[PDB]
Structure 1
């Protein structure tokens, strides 16, 4: 049946979308964990720039 075929295609297609985006989160998670070092190493550079 076509209607069942359509829905099955849609579900897996959305699953492929969840996979390509789950990877993005892992990537941007790394670029944020590594980038969290600035918070500890900031706020004293610009003291006299104030």
Structure 2
């Protein structure tokens, strides 16, 4: 039936919206951990700038 498959198609799109977003979460959890080096090396350049 089309009505039942309308929901199935709708859920089919939702099920992959998640995968693409999940891959984006992985993409943005690499760059967060790559830029975490600043956490260590900050808070000392701007001393006389204060």
TM-score, with length taken from structure 1: 0.94
Per-residue deviation at 1:6?
A: 0.1
Partner of 1:21: 21
What residue ranges of structure 1 are gaps of 5+ in the alignment? none
Runs of 4+ in structure 1 deviating by more than 4 angstroms, as ranges, are none
Per-residue deviation at 1:46?
A: 0.4
Partner of 1:39: 39
| C-alpha distance after superposition, 1:2-50 (max 9, x if no partner) | 1101011011110110011000000000000011110110000000100
Paired residue total? 50
The SS at the match of 1:6 is: helix
TM-score, with length taken from structure 2: 0.94
What residue ranges of structure 2 are gaps of 5+ in the alignment? none
